[PDB]
């Protein structure tokens, strides 16, 4: 009985006009006593000559996670036996369990151990054995970079440091610059996550993120969840400009015209009718398990936590460490089929859209796993 819009005759996402650099997403982890905090500050400061934002000829939005493209652990040079042993270890596990494949490891404060190459190799090992042997990272996706947060090899090899006697690699900045971000996400099909929803004057207001694609004033947005649609009446991009469009990566505050408030809930993803987001009852996922009490049984009820959506699911086991299994215990990879107990929910593969395909699993109060969605059913 319903009748679709359709679209006007409007503009194309004219972002490229003002030569933009890819915005790469980082999470930066490490002990309080790794110079993690000094490293960032010193990057701000030196880029000062010439949520935390650094540009080079790429643009690095760094963020926190306790959905993003790469990562770096940083740590320090002291009597190294005991630590490595914080909960930077769990951070490393979480990032694997989620999408992340590429780390940069800032080896900080080598000046304090007189830029000794044997010390750099020693710690490269201890760290490589945890990130590679014990956690699933490939050797060729874990890059090591010596550093001194109190000015180092982060921006310019233009140090005549004793370090450049032996060290031939890039600066930290250049190591970051060599990590290839997703191609051109403002061009991929539109995915807009809904963080909040509330009534206004002649519009239901929604706020959220542009997860992929683009969106402009007077366009049609489709909500697969309520099977309803709307006209964009306003777009407030990042700041609060007189902006008229937004692109992948921008937070948005929209105003929607021909839709009622109750037909639009946080956790919904909106999109165009062209390549619409798919709502599904079940999906396939590569989860990875943490320190858990009882194991996850095939048929267990867990609470899935994606965006604003947290909902009850059942997990059926496909395979564990590549072998068939009747239980999934601590510190284990697993291919699983997860089914929503509460209806149809909208999502994407992690391939297509990290923030939409990375989730957490919890049991009662405890978090027990995290993973990426690999297939829709």
């Amino acid at each position: 009985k319903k009748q679709n819009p359709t679209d006007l005759v409007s503009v194309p996402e004219i972002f490229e006009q003002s030569n933009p650099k890819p915005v790469v997403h980082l999470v930066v982890t490490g002990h309080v006593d790794s110079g993690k905090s000094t490293m960032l500050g010193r990057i701000m400061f030196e880029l000062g000559e010439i949520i935390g934002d650094a540009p080079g000829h790429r643009d690095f939005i760094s963020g926190m996670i306790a959905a993003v493209l790469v990562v770096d652990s940083s740590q320090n040079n002291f009597e190294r036996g005991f630590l490595e042993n914080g909960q930077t270890r769990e951070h490393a596990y979480l990032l694997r369990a989620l999408g992340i494949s590429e780390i940069v490891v800032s080896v900080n404060k080598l000046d304090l151990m007189s830029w000794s190459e044997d010390r750099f190799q020693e710690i490269k090992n201890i760290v490589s054995d945890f990130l590679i042997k014990m956690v699933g990272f490939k050797t060729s996706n874990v890059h090591f970079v010596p550093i001194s947060a109190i000015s180092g090899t982060n921006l310019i090899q233009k140090d005549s440091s004793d370090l450049y006697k032996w060290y031939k690699g890039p600066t930290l900045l250049s190591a970051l610059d060599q990590l290839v971000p997703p191609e051109k996400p403002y061009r991929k099909p539109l995915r807009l996550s809904i963080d909040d929803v509330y009534r206004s004057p002649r519009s239901v207001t929604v706020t959220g993120r542009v997860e992929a694609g683009n969106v402009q004033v007077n366009q049609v947005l489709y909500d697969v969840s309520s099977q309803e649609d709307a006209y964009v009446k306003n777009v407030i991009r990042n700041s609060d400009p007189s902006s008229t469009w937004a692109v992948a990566g921008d937070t948005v505050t929209l105003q929607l015209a021909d839709i009622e408030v109750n037909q639009l809930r946080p956790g919904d993803i909106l999109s165009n009718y062209e390549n619409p987001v798919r709502r599904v009852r079940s999906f396939v996922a590569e989860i990875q398990t943490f320190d858990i009490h009882g194991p996850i049984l095939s048929g267990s009820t867990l609470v899935l936590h994606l965006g604003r959506t947290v909902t009850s699911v059942s997990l059926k086991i496909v395979t564990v460490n590549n072998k068939r299994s009747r239980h999934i215990a601590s510190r284990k990879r697993a291919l699983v089929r997860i089914s929503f107990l509460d209806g149809l929910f909208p999502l994407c593969l992690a391939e297509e859209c990290p923030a939409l395909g990375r989730f957490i699993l919890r049991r009662s109060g405890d978090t027990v796993a995290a993973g990426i969605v690999k297939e829709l059913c």
């Binding site: 909040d196 408030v261 809930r265 009820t301 059942s314 009747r326 009662s364 109060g365």
Partner: protein, 341 residues
Amino acid sequence: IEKNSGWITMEPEDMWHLYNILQVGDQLKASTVRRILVENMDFDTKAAQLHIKRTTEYHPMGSYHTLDLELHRNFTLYNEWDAFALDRVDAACNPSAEIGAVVLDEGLANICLITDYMTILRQRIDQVIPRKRRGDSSAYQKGLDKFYDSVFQSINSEFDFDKLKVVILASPGFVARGLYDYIFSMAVKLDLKQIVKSKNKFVILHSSTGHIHSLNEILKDPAVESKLADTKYVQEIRVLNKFYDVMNEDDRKAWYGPNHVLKAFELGAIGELLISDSLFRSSDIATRKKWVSLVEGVKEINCPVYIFSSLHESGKQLDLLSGIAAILTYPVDEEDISEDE
């Protein structure tokens, strides 16, 4: 009533027992508007009605009817009365304590009535609570008050506070304490003698989520053990968790799934350890026989059998893990397929 085959002539739970009792191929009659071969049973979970579906007697024949069962007026059944078929037809009646339970999170409420054999969802309330704006908290506050008012209204219509022994309020955060206060303020403002009498029956609990499966968290809570431990629904939660504690100790002592439990029964493995589900009420006769046998088998030796009701969350959980599991007496190593999807 019962020679050797026969027939029997006989609370809202009794519709459920009957749903379990009824089998395709059976024949029954009572009053309707215009004796059938039973072909379809339909239990409205909410939960007045039982709809049984052709005409197998005189017609002042060969055309569909549907019975639409009454609750106090009686009916007549009909060749193989299974050992299971008989332990239910014998259960209630003769019977022997209802409980109200509200599981909530901020904009979310699940209003449940719980009995020995049934958990029923009277109301789900799912409202969008606008977020607090760092300059403005109106939309949040107004959304929150509508919700407080909503569950109030709901429980106030769904619950009969004379009948229930306990009404639990449980939430992950502050909601459940906020509600307890809100309920009794409003009930004192307006004059609601029903609730004010019942204040002593309300208990406020922690819960991890406002989702229904959270029911397995309580009603196992120590704060509610005293009043509830002698109930079927707690008995199911215990055993299930007993099953889990063993899984946790030694995964060779806790099996689950049809081909697994059968295998375990071929060995001496089975003990205080039948965790079986009412949902084995299939129409294939061949495959009904084997469960009745297994339950008889473990029953004729001195080991407990627990037929979980598929309506409880506990039972639902047992279904998800294919509706049989078993603890074991000794650790057993094996590798069986389970015949499903």
